[PDB]
Short mmCIF file of C-alpha atoms and ligand atoms in Angstrom, two decimals:
data_model
loop_
_atom_site.label_atom_id
_atom_site.label_comp_id
_atom_site.label_asym_id
_atom_site.label_seq_id
_atom_site.Cartn_x
_atom_site.Cartn_y
_atom_site.Cartn_z
CA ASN A 30 174.34 -186.53 -2.51
CA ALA A 31 170.97 -184.78 -2.15
CA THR A 32 167.53 -185.79 -3.44
CA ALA A 33 164.50 -184.00 -4.92
CA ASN A 34 162.71 -183.89 -1.55
CA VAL A 35 164.00 -180.38 -0.79
CA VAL A 36 161.22 -178.97 -2.97
CA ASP A 37 158.49 -180.16 -0.60
CA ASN A 38 159.82 -178.67 2.63
CA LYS A 39 160.88 -175.56 0.71
CA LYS A 40 157.28 -175.19 -0.44
CA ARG A 41 156.08 -175.60 3.16
CA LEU A 42 158.45 -172.84 4.25
CA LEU A 43 157.24 -170.63 1.42
CA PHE A 44 153.62 -171.13 2.44
CA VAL A 45 154.46 -170.26 6.05
CA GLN A 46 156.33 -167.11 5.03
CA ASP A 47 153.59 -166.01 2.63
CA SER A 48 150.89 -166.50 5.25
CA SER A 49 153.00 -164.49 7.73
CA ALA A 50 153.36 -161.38 5.52
CA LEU A 51 149.66 -160.62 4.91
CA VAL A 52 148.60 -160.62 8.56
CA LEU A 53 151.58 -158.54 9.43
CA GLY A 54 150.99 -155.27 7.63
CA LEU A 55 147.25 -155.74 7.93
CA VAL A 56 147.76 -155.54 11.69
CA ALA A 57 150.03 -152.58 11.05
CA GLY A 58 147.31 -150.87 9.04
CA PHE A 59 144.81 -151.56 11.81
CA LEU A 60 147.09 -149.78 14.30
CA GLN A 61 147.79 -146.93 11.84
CA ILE A 62 151.56 -147.40 11.99
CA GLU A 63 153.58 -144.63 10.33
CA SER A 64 156.29 -144.78 7.68
CA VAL A 65 159.55 -145.93 9.29
CA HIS A 66 158.10 -147.51 12.43
CA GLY A 67 156.18 -149.81 10.10
CA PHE A 68 159.30 -151.06 8.35
CA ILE A 69 161.18 -151.60 11.61
CA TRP A 70 158.14 -153.40 13.04
CA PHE A 71 157.96 -155.63 9.98
CA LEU A 72 161.66 -156.52 10.06
CA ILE A 73 161.55 -157.39 13.75
CA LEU A 74 158.41 -159.52 13.65
CA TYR A 75 159.33 -161.23 10.37
CA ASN A 76 162.76 -162.31 11.60
CA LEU A 77 161.14 -163.39 14.89
CA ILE A 78 158.74 -165.62 12.96
CA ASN A 79 161.65 -167.04 10.97
CA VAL A 80 163.51 -167.84 14.20
CA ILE A 81 160.48 -169.54 15.80
CA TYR A 82 160.08 -171.50 12.58
CA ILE A 83 163.68 -172.66 12.88
CA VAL A 84 162.99 -173.66 16.51
CA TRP A 85 159.60 -175.34 16.27
CA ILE A 86 158.90 -176.96 12.89
CA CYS A 87 162.51 -177.48 11.97
CA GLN A 88 163.85 -179.29 15.06
CA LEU A 89 166.79 -176.94 15.75
CA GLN A 90 168.68 -178.51 12.80
CA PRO A 91 168.32 -176.20 9.76
CA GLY A 92 170.73 -178.48 7.97
CA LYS A 93 169.33 -181.92 7.09
CA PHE A 94 166.20 -180.20 5.72
CA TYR A 95 167.73 -177.36 3.64
CA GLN A 96 171.20 -176.77 2.19
CA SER A 97 172.72 -173.41 3.12
CA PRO A 98 169.84 -172.75 5.56
CA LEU A 99 170.98 -169.24 6.54
CA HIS A 100 170.68 -168.31 2.86
CA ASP A 101 167.35 -170.07 2.29
CA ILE A 102 165.22 -169.17 5.31
CA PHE A 103 166.31 -165.54 5.75
CA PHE A 104 167.71 -163.98 2.57
CA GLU A 105 165.77 -165.91 -0.04
CA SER A 106 162.25 -164.64 -0.78
CA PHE A 107 162.83 -161.41 1.15
CA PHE A 108 162.08 -158.85 -1.58
CA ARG A 109 159.11 -161.06 -2.51
CA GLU A 110 157.78 -160.59 1.06
CA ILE A 111 158.53 -156.94 1.86
CA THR A 112 156.24 -156.11 -1.08
CA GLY A 113 153.35 -158.29 0.05
CA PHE A 114 153.72 -156.60 3.43
CA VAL A 115 153.59 -153.18 1.73
CA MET A 116 150.44 -154.22 -0.13
CA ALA A 117 148.69 -155.43 3.02
CA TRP A 118 149.84 -152.36 4.95
CA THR A 119 148.44 -150.02 2.31
CA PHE A 120 145.19 -151.98 2.30
CA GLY A 121 144.94 -151.77 6.09
CA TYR A 122 145.88 -148.11 6.41
CA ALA A 123 142.99 -147.16 4.07
CA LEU A 124 140.35 -148.60 6.45
CA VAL B 192 149.29 -109.94 -11.43
CA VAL B 193 152.53 -109.66 -9.46
CA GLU B 194 154.15 -112.60 -7.66
CA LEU B 195 156.67 -112.20 -4.85
CA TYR B 196 159.73 -114.41 -4.28
CA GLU B 197 162.59 -114.31 -1.82
CA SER B 198 165.11 -114.52 -4.65
CA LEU B 199 164.79 -115.24 -8.36
CA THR B 200 167.88 -117.44 -8.63
CA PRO B 201 166.43 -120.95 -8.86
CA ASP B 202 167.71 -122.25 -5.48
CA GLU B 203 168.38 -119.58 -2.88
CA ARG B 204 167.29 -118.44 0.54
CA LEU B 205 169.10 -115.10 0.43
CA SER B 206 167.47 -114.47 3.83
CA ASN B 207 164.75 -116.12 5.95
CA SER B 208 167.28 -117.80 8.23
CA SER B 209 164.92 -120.17 10.01
CA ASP B 210 166.98 -121.93 12.66
CA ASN B 211 166.95 -119.68 15.75
CA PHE B 212 166.93 -116.12 14.50
CA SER B 213 163.71 -114.70 16.08
CA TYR B 214 163.21 -111.87 13.58
CA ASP B 215 162.37 -108.37 14.84
CA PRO B 216 160.20 -106.57 12.25
CA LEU B 217 159.91 -103.24 14.08
CA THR B 218 163.62 -102.56 13.63
CA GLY B 219 163.30 -103.09 9.89
CA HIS B 220 165.80 -105.95 9.64
CA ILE B 221 163.50 -108.12 7.54
CA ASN B 222 164.32 -109.46 4.09
CA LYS B 223 163.00 -107.53 1.07
CA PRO B 224 161.14 -109.10 -1.88
CA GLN B 225 161.75 -109.61 -5.55
CA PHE B 226 158.84 -109.78 -7.94
CA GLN B 227 157.62 -110.78 -11.39
CA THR B 228 154.65 -109.15 -13.09
CA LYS B 229 152.31 -109.72 -16.03
CA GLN B 230 149.20 -108.11 -17.55
CA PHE B 231 146.12 -109.68 -19.13
CA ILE B 232 143.15 -108.33 -21.09
CA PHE B 233 139.54 -109.16 -20.12
CA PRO B 234 136.40 -108.40 -22.21
CA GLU B 235 133.94 -107.21 -19.56
CA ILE B 236 134.01 -104.65 -16.79
CA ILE B 237 134.73 -106.25 -13.41
CA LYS B 238 132.85 -104.59 -10.58
CA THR B 239 134.55 -106.42 -7.70
CA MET B 240 136.83 -109.31 -6.83
CA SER B 241 137.53 -111.84 -4.08
CA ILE B 242 139.47 -115.07 -3.46
CA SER B 243 137.90 -118.29 -2.23
CA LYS B 244 138.58 -120.11 1.04
CA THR B 245 138.73 -123.75 2.12
CA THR B 246 139.47 -125.60 5.37
CA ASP B 247 143.09 -126.18 4.35
CA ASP B 248 144.27 -123.81 1.63
CA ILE B 249 145.43 -126.47 -0.83
CA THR B 250 143.14 -126.16 -3.88
CA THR B 251 143.70 -123.29 -6.29
CA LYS B 252 142.48 -119.92 -5.12
CA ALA B 253 139.87 -119.26 -7.85
CA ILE B 254 139.85 -115.47 -8.20
CA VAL B 255 136.10 -114.77 -8.28
CA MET B 256 134.70 -111.66 -9.97
CA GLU B 257 131.36 -109.87 -10.01
CA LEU B 258 130.83 -108.10 -13.34
CA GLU B 259 128.70 -105.07 -14.16
CA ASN B 260 125.87 -107.27 -15.48
CA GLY B 261 125.62 -109.03 -12.13
CA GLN B 262 126.97 -112.24 -13.62
CA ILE B 263 129.64 -113.88 -11.47
CA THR B 264 132.67 -115.62 -13.00
CA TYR B 265 135.79 -117.14 -11.45
CA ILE B 266 139.13 -118.06 -12.97
CA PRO B 267 141.73 -120.24 -11.21
CA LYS B 268 145.04 -118.68 -10.25
CA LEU B 269 146.81 -121.18 -12.50
CA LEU B 270 145.61 -119.29 -15.56
CA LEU B 271 146.92 -115.96 -14.22
CA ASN B 272 150.54 -117.13 -14.34
CA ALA B 273 153.45 -114.79 -13.94
CA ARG B 274 156.77 -116.17 -15.21
CA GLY B 275 154.82 -117.32 -18.26
CA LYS B 276 156.17 -117.85 -21.74
CA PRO B 277 154.41 -117.51 -25.10
CA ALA B 278 154.01 -121.34 -25.59
CA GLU B 279 156.76 -121.33 -28.25
CA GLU B 280 159.45 -121.32 -25.56
CA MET B 281 157.53 -123.74 -23.31
CA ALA B 282 158.26 -126.68 -25.62
CA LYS B 283 161.08 -128.94 -24.39
CA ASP B 284 161.99 -126.44 -21.68
CA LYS B 285 162.90 -128.96 -18.98
CA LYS B 286 163.39 -126.22 -16.39
CA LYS B 287 159.85 -124.88 -16.40
CA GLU B 288 157.47 -126.69 -13.95
CA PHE B 289 155.24 -129.71 -13.81
CA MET B 290 152.40 -128.89 -16.27
CA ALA B 291 153.69 -125.37 -16.90
CA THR B 292 150.82 -123.24 -18.17
CA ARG C 69 129.20 -123.72 -4.38
CA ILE C 70 132.31 -123.84 -6.57
CA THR C 71 135.02 -126.47 -7.06
CA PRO C 72 138.12 -124.84 -8.63
CA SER C 73 140.15 -128.05 -8.99
CA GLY C 74 137.23 -130.32 -9.84
CA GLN C 75 135.38 -132.54 -7.39
CA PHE C 76 137.85 -135.21 -6.28
CA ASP C 77 136.70 -135.90 -2.69
CA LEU C 78 133.13 -136.91 -3.45
CA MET C 79 133.41 -139.44 -6.24
CA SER C 80 130.55 -138.57 -8.65
CA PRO C 81 126.78 -138.36 -9.09
CA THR C 82 127.21 -140.30 -12.38
CA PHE C 83 129.29 -143.31 -11.35
CA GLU C 84 128.67 -146.44 -13.43
CA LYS C 85 128.18 -149.08 -10.77
CA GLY C 86 126.14 -151.43 -12.96
CA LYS C 87 128.84 -151.78 -15.62
CA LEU C 88 131.42 -152.62 -12.96
CA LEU C 89 129.20 -155.28 -11.39
CA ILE C 90 128.50 -156.67 -14.88
CA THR C 91 132.24 -156.95 -15.54
CA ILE C 92 132.80 -158.71 -12.20
CA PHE C 93 129.92 -161.12 -12.82
CA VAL C 94 131.09 -161.90 -16.35
CA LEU C 95 134.59 -162.70 -15.06
CA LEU C 96 133.15 -164.84 -12.26
CA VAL C 97 130.89 -166.93 -14.49
CA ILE C 98 133.45 -167.35 -17.27
CA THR C 99 135.98 -168.63 -14.73
CA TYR C 100 133.42 -170.92 -13.10
CA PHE C 101 132.49 -172.40 -16.50
CA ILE C 102 135.98 -172.72 -18.00
CA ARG C 103 137.46 -174.35 -14.87
CA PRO C 104 135.91 -177.85 -15.38
CA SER C 105 136.96 -177.96 -19.02
CA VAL C 106 140.62 -177.19 -18.44
CA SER C 107 140.75 -179.38 -15.33
CA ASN C 108 139.22 -182.53 -16.83
CA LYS C 109 140.68 -182.22 -20.32
CA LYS C 110 144.27 -181.32 -19.55
CA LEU C 111 144.73 -183.31 -16.33
CA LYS C 112 143.21 -186.50 -17.76
CA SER C 113 144.88 -186.16 -21.19
CA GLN C 114 148.40 -185.22 -20.06
CA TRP C 115 148.84 -188.39 -17.98
CA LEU C 116 147.07 -190.58 -20.59
CA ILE C 117 145.35 -192.70 -17.93
CA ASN D 192 156.43 -160.80 -23.77
CA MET D 193 152.80 -161.23 -24.80
CA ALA D 194 151.92 -162.61 -21.35
CA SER D 195 153.29 -159.44 -19.79
CA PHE D 196 152.07 -157.03 -22.47
CA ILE D 197 148.41 -158.01 -22.91
CA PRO D 198 146.84 -157.97 -19.44
CA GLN D 199 148.78 -155.12 -17.80
CA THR D 200 147.93 -152.76 -20.68
CA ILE D 201 144.30 -153.91 -20.58
CA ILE D 202 144.13 -153.23 -16.84
CA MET D 203 145.77 -149.82 -17.16
CA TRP D 204 143.23 -148.99 -19.87
CA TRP D 205 140.29 -150.08 -17.70
CA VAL D 206 141.58 -148.27 -14.61
CA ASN D 207 142.22 -145.00 -16.47
CA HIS D 208 138.76 -145.23 -18.04
CA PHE D 209 136.60 -145.98 -15.02
CA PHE D 210 138.64 -144.36 -12.22
CA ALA D 211 139.86 -140.88 -13.15
CA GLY D 212 140.08 -137.56 -11.33
CA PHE D 213 139.82 -139.02 -7.82
CA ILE D 214 141.80 -139.09 -4.60
CA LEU D 215 141.62 -142.64 -3.26
CA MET D 216 143.83 -142.76 -0.15
CA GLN D 217 147.10 -141.63 1.39
CA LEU D 218 150.07 -143.99 1.46
CA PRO D 219 151.71 -144.53 4.87
CA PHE D 220 155.24 -143.75 3.57
CA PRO D 221 156.45 -140.43 2.05
CA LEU D 222 157.45 -140.66 -1.60
CA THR D 223 159.37 -138.00 -3.61
CA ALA D 224 157.86 -135.38 -5.86
CA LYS D 225 158.31 -137.20 -9.16
CA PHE D 226 155.96 -139.78 -7.70
CA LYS D 227 153.49 -136.93 -7.19
CA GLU D 228 153.91 -136.35 -10.91
CA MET D 229 153.36 -140.02 -11.76
CA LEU D 230 150.58 -140.95 -9.33
CA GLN D 231 148.23 -137.91 -9.16
CA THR D 232 147.37 -137.71 -12.89
CA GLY D 233 143.69 -137.22 -12.05
CA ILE D 234 144.06 -133.95 -10.13
CA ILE D 235 145.30 -130.59 -11.43
CA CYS D 236 146.41 -129.07 -8.11
CA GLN D 237 150.02 -128.00 -7.47
CA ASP D 238 150.78 -128.38 -3.73
CA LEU D 239 148.41 -131.13 -2.55
CA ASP D 240 151.01 -133.64 -1.27
CA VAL D 241 153.19 -136.47 -2.46
CA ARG D 242 151.48 -138.88 -0.03
CA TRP D 243 147.98 -138.48 -1.52
CA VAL D 244 147.45 -140.69 -4.56
CA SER D 245 144.90 -141.34 -7.29
CA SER D 246 143.49 -144.78 -8.06
CA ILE D 247 146.27 -145.89 -10.39
CA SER D 248 148.69 -146.13 -7.47
CA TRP D 249 146.59 -148.95 -6.06
CA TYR D 250 147.35 -150.87 -9.24
CA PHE D 251 151.05 -149.96 -9.12
CA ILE D 252 151.32 -151.68 -5.74
CA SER D 253 148.88 -154.51 -6.46
CA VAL D 254 151.02 -155.72 -9.37
CA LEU D 255 154.05 -156.23 -7.12
CA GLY D 256 152.36 -157.56 -3.99
CA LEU D 257 149.86 -160.09 -5.39
CA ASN D 258 152.30 -163.02 -5.50
CA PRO D 259 151.57 -164.23 -1.93
CA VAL D 260 147.81 -164.07 -2.57
CA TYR D 261 148.15 -166.10 -5.76
CA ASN D 262 150.23 -168.63 -3.86
CA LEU D 263 147.78 -168.88 -0.97
CA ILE D 264 144.57 -169.23 -3.01
CA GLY D 265 146.31 -172.10 -4.82
CA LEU D 266 148.18 -171.85 -8.10
CA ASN D 267 151.19 -173.53 -9.64
CA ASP D 268 153.63 -173.28 -12.53
CA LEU E 187 123.48 -104.40 21.67
CA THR E 188 124.25 -107.88 22.97
CA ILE E 189 122.07 -110.67 21.57
CA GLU E 190 121.79 -114.29 22.72
CA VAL E 191 121.55 -116.62 19.71
CA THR E 192 119.49 -119.72 20.48
CA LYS E 193 117.93 -122.49 18.40
CA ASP E 194 114.60 -120.71 18.93
CA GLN E 195 113.96 -117.02 18.27
CA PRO E 196 116.86 -115.05 19.83
CA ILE E 197 116.54 -112.56 22.68
CA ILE E 198 118.05 -109.06 22.78
CA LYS E 199 119.64 -109.44 26.20
CA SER E 200 121.27 -106.00 26.45
CA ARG E 201 121.20 -102.52 24.92
CA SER E 202 123.42 -99.69 26.11
CA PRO E 203 125.25 -96.62 24.77
CA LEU E 204 128.95 -96.27 24.13
CA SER E 205 131.06 -94.03 26.35
CA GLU E 206 130.89 -91.21 23.76
CA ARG E 207 127.61 -90.73 21.89
CA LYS E 208 128.76 -89.86 18.38
CA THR E 209 128.04 -91.39 14.99
CA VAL E 210 130.01 -94.59 14.36
CA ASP E 211 131.94 -94.99 11.10
CA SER E 212 133.55 -98.41 11.58
CA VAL E 213 134.61 -101.04 14.10
CA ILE E 214 137.75 -103.21 14.12
CA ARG E 215 137.94 -106.42 16.17
CA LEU E 216 141.11 -106.53 18.26
CA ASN E 217 142.68 -109.67 19.80
CA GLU E 218 140.12 -112.39 20.49
CA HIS E 219 140.96 -113.18 24.10
CA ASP E 220 141.22 -109.59 25.37
CA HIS E 221 137.73 -108.75 24.00
CA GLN E 222 138.75 -105.34 22.65
CA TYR E 223 137.35 -103.27 19.79
CA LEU E 224 138.64 -100.09 18.14
CA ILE E 225 135.72 -97.83 17.14
CA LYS E 226 136.24 -95.09 14.54
CA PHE E 227 133.65 -92.33 14.82
CA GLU E 228 132.93 -90.00 11.95
CA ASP E 229 134.80 -86.82 12.78
CA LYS E 230 137.62 -89.44 12.75
CA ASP E 231 137.90 -90.12 16.50
CA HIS E 232 139.15 -93.46 17.81
CA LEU E 233 137.80 -95.13 20.96
CA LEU E 234 139.22 -98.27 22.52
CA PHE E 235 136.40 -100.39 23.88
CA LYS E 236 136.51 -103.29 26.34
CA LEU E 237 132.99 -104.63 26.66
CA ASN E 238 132.91 -107.64 28.98
CA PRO E 239 134.35 -111.15 29.51
CA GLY E 240 131.71 -112.24 26.96
CA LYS E 241 129.25 -113.95 29.33
CA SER E 242 156.86 -105.91 24.64
CA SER E 243 153.69 -107.36 23.07
CA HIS E 244 152.67 -104.44 20.89
CA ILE E 245 149.36 -104.40 19.01
CA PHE E 246 149.32 -102.62 15.67
CA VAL E 247 146.32 -101.38 13.66
CA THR E 248 145.95 -100.02 10.12
CA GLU E 249 143.25 -97.66 8.84
CA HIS E 250 142.81 -96.46 5.27
CA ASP E 251 140.88 -93.57 3.73
CA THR E 252 140.62 -92.06 0.27
CA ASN E 253 143.39 -89.71 1.48
CA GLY E 254 145.91 -92.35 2.55
CA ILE E 255 146.98 -95.14 4.88
CA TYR E 256 147.52 -94.21 8.52
CA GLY E 257 148.43 -96.96 10.97
CA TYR E 258 148.15 -96.91 14.77
CA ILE E 259 149.73 -98.51 17.85
CA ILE E 260 147.68 -99.66 20.87
CA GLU E 261 149.73 -99.38 24.08
CA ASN E 262 148.56 -99.30 27.71
CA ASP E 263 144.90 -99.20 26.61
CA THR E 264 145.53 -96.05 24.55
CA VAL E 265 145.80 -95.44 20.81
CA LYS E 266 148.73 -93.51 19.31
CA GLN E 267 149.35 -92.31 15.77
CA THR E 268 152.51 -93.91 14.41
CA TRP E 269 153.01 -92.86 10.77
CA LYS E 270 151.11 -91.49 7.75
CA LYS E 271 151.19 -92.05 4.00
CA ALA E 272 148.98 -89.29 2.57
CA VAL E 273 148.33 -88.64 -1.13
CA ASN E 274 148.78 -85.27 -2.85
CA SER E 275 145.99 -82.82 -3.69
CA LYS E 276 145.32 -84.47 -7.09
CA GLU E 277 145.91 -88.12 -6.15
CA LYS E 278 143.20 -90.30 -4.58
CA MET E 279 143.58 -93.81 -3.22
CA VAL E 280 141.04 -96.13 -4.86
CA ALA E 281 141.73 -99.75 -3.84
CA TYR E 282 143.34 -101.27 -0.74
CA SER E 283 143.73 -104.81 0.53
CA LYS E 284 145.35 -106.72 3.41
CA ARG E 285 147.18 -110.03 3.50
CA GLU E 286 144.70 -112.67 4.59
CA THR E 287 146.10 -115.26 6.95
CA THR E 288 146.58 -118.58 5.15
CA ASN E 289 147.51 -122.07 6.26
CA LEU E 290 151.01 -122.92 5.05
CA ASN E 291 151.07 -126.11 2.95
CA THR E 292 154.26 -125.79 0.88
CA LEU E 293 157.15 -123.44 1.50
CA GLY E 294 158.30 -123.04 -2.11
CA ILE E 295 157.21 -123.55 -5.69
CA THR E 296 159.27 -126.29 -7.32
CA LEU E 297 160.58 -126.25 -10.89
CA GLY E 298 161.29 -128.86 -13.46
CA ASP E 299 164.85 -130.10 -12.75
CA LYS E 300 163.68 -129.98 -9.09
CA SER E 301 164.87 -126.56 -7.99
CA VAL E 302 162.67 -124.43 -5.69
CA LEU E 303 162.12 -120.65 -5.66
CA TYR E 304 161.20 -120.14 -1.97
CA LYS E 305 158.14 -117.89 -2.33
CA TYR E 306 158.11 -114.78 -0.16
CA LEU E 307 156.01 -115.22 3.02
CA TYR E 308 156.10 -112.17 5.28
CA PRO E 309 152.76 -111.63 7.04
CA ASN E 310 152.58 -107.87 7.65
CA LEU E 311 151.92 -106.55 4.14
CA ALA E 312 149.25 -104.41 2.50
CA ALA E 313 148.69 -103.40 -1.13
CA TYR E 314 147.01 -100.34 -2.56
CA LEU E 315 146.42 -98.30 -5.73
CA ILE E 316 146.93 -94.55 -6.20
CA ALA E 317 145.08 -92.94 -9.10
CA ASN E 318 146.76 -89.72 -10.28
CA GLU E 319 145.32 -87.05 -12.49
CA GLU E 320 147.72 -84.45 -13.95
CA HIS E 321 149.72 -87.41 -15.23
CA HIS E 322 146.89 -89.95 -15.89
CA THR E 323 148.67 -92.79 -14.09
CA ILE E 324 147.84 -95.70 -11.79
CA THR E 325 150.49 -96.62 -9.22
CA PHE E 326 150.65 -99.91 -7.28
CA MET F 64 185.72 -165.44 -7.47
CA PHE F 65 185.57 -161.70 -6.72
CA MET F 66 185.13 -161.05 -10.43
CA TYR F 67 181.57 -162.33 -10.10
CA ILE F 68 180.92 -159.96 -7.19
CA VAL F 69 182.34 -156.95 -9.04
CA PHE F 70 180.42 -157.78 -12.23
CA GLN F 71 177.15 -158.20 -10.33
CA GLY F 72 177.90 -154.89 -8.63
CA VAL F 73 178.21 -153.29 -12.06
CA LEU F 74 174.89 -154.87 -13.04
CA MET F 75 173.35 -153.51 -9.81
CA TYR F 76 174.83 -150.04 -10.44
CA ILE F 77 173.78 -149.69 -14.10
CA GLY F 78 170.14 -149.73 -13.02
CA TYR F 79 170.78 -147.05 -10.41
CA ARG F 80 172.72 -144.80 -12.77
CA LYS F 81 170.61 -145.11 -15.89
CA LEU F 82 166.93 -145.38 -14.85
CA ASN F 83 166.40 -144.60 -11.15
CA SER F 84 168.62 -141.48 -11.33
CA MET F 85 166.46 -139.71 -13.90
CA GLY F 86 164.23 -138.07 -11.28
CA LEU F 87 163.45 -140.66 -8.60
CA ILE F 88 166.37 -140.28 -6.12
CA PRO F 89 166.95 -137.67 -3.35
CA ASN F 90 170.04 -135.36 -2.91
CA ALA F 91 168.13 -132.77 -4.93
CA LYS F 92 167.18 -129.61 -3.07
CA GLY F 93 163.58 -130.03 -4.25
CA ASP F 94 163.24 -133.22 -2.20
CA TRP F 95 164.10 -131.85 1.28
CA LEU F 96 161.64 -128.96 0.89
CA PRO F 97 158.87 -130.59 3.03
CA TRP F 98 161.30 -130.78 6.00
CA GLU F 99 162.15 -127.06 6.32
CA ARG F 100 161.09 -124.39 8.80
CA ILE F 101 159.25 -121.06 8.63
CA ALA F 102 161.49 -118.63 10.67
CA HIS F 103 158.58 -117.22 12.76
CA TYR F 104 158.80 -113.63 11.54
CA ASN F 105 157.04 -111.40 14.04
CA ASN F 106 156.97 -113.36 17.35
CA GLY F 107 155.80 -110.33 19.38
CA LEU F 108 153.23 -108.53 17.22
CA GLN F 109 149.61 -108.85 16.09
CA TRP F 110 148.84 -106.34 13.29
CA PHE F 111 145.08 -106.30 13.12
CA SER F 112 143.61 -104.17 10.32
CA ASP F 113 140.44 -103.46 8.35
C1 X3P G 545 159.51 -147.54 -2.62
C2 X3P G 545 159.30 -148.02 -1.15
C3 X3P G 545 158.97 -146.80 -0.27
C4 X3P G 545 160.27 -146.27 0.41
C5 X3P G 545 160.04 -144.83 0.94
C6 X3P G 545 161.00 -144.56 2.14
C7 X3P G 545 160.23 -144.84 3.47
C8 X3P G 545 161.18 -144.56 4.66
C9 X3P G 545 161.13 -143.05 5.04
O1 X3P G 545 160.07 -142.54 5.27
O2 X3P G 545 162.33 -142.27 5.13
C10 X3P G 545 162.23 -140.97 4.63
C11 X3P G 545 161.90 -140.99 3.12
O3 X3P G 545 162.18 -139.73 2.54
C12 X3P G 545 162.41 -139.83 1.14
O4 X3P G 545 161.51 -139.79 0.39
C13 X3P G 545 163.87 -139.97 0.62
C14 X3P G 545 164.10 -141.44 0.20
C15 X3P G 545 165.36 -141.98 0.95
C16 X3P G 545 165.66 -143.43 0.49
C17 X3P G 545 166.36 -143.40 -0.89
C18 X3P G 545 166.85 -144.85 -1.26
C19 X3P G 545 167.93 -144.76 -2.40
C20 X3P G 545 163.56 -140.25 4.83
O5 X3P G 545 163.95 -140.38 6.19
P1 X3P G 545 163.83 -139.00 7.16
O6 X3P G 545 164.21 -139.33 8.57
O7 X3P G 545 164.72 -137.91 6.60
O8 X3P G 545 162.24 -138.48 7.11
C21 X3P G 545 161.64 -137.92 8.27
C22 X3P G 545 161.16 -139.04 9.27
N1 X3P G 545 159.97 -139.82 8.84
C23 X3P G 545 158.77 -138.96 8.78
C24 X3P G 545 160.18 -140.47 7.53
C25 X3P G 545 159.74 -140.85 9.83
#
């Protein structure tokens, strides 16, 4: 049914998400965002970047490039990206 | 050394209702204290005493003493601990404190 | 001047900066020297070209 | 797990040796008091805060959050 | 005297007497913004003093002697005796101290098992020692 | 299929009960202490002294 080409585009998504969780947080630490506003800010901007990724790079068809796309873009690698955001936010708040 | 607490039961505000009460001290309605006291022995005659100050009073108060010799020595308030125990009853006493002296 | 709780705001007058820079430089050079060996040996031996 | 056990213990050893009895920063989020017990080992105060941390806290976060940096600099399994 | 402190050598800009020319025992600074002072003359006479701009809201004062602790109330720019705690013929007060104002960082000391004792914080307190002969005792 | 959900819930709840509930969770009274008030004792008085 499916081939072993999902790994490549999955890796591209992972690179995009990783590179969009260490400039968020750093920006938050530059603005001296406080405890809960920071988390709400991160959730809003991170899901916005996921949506614009679904629109722009993926051509409005999450299927045909991932299987179960709502599971794979949004919920997968979410607790591996809140923590990188926390690291960058702590690094930014201390400068 | 005597230390003053609102109530000695481990979780109680017997008084000090803080929401909207607007206490009136001149009537005498205020809450009254409870206290715990201890005594210590020092070698040398202490001529006078003071307590140190900082910008925000976070660090320990460092009771500072001028002796009869003129030498000046301080001891932190952590050493002068009321509610202390003889270090036999401090072992595996979960209720005590963090780093109970 | 007295410091009842120790001096934690100002770091130290006896900080060992040179040992820390020596550790960083040792790690940097050992990585830079071990990288060609692992790269060439394992990548060219695992595919048996 | 030797891969887990060797380097994290070595780094804890190095951090507790070189960086002790300091206040490094304040975290942006309020922890609970047992984290004041865990994180402020350097200092012997009693009411400083929970939000003010010694140097070891910077390791306790950097262990969890370094995966994206390792991915970006270029590494593979 | 009123003195102008400058980076250079200061200047004594004013000298003048008080209203009553008696020997001065002590001076207490009253509220900062009203620029008041309570002056205790030997012979134990109290004068309220309002110097210059520096160019019910009761106010309470407390004086102590070797004979006891006295207390006063300042109302309508006049001083009034309010109570007295005087020692006996053979007692003599030796040490006295006031509660210094302190920034409040934590409201209670916390125990292991995370219970909190809620330390007593009431601002208007004073402590003193009475030394008694004829029983050889020290009272706090 | 709900057996998998319930079992994974038990595996999610064992960690909460056994290890995070030792001292690292609120609903203790010693955790809401930094969000309590002072009661503003005098509110009309000064009390200067020596
Ligand atoms: C390990 C990651 C770091 C997570 C720390 C939580 C950060 C969110 C946070 O600050 O919420 C705090 C954490 O107060 C507490 O410390 C209680 C924790 C409540 C969550 C427990 C989860 C089981 C509680 O909400 P709050 O409204 O009662 O506090 C006052 C408002 N605030 C100043 C916080 C804006």
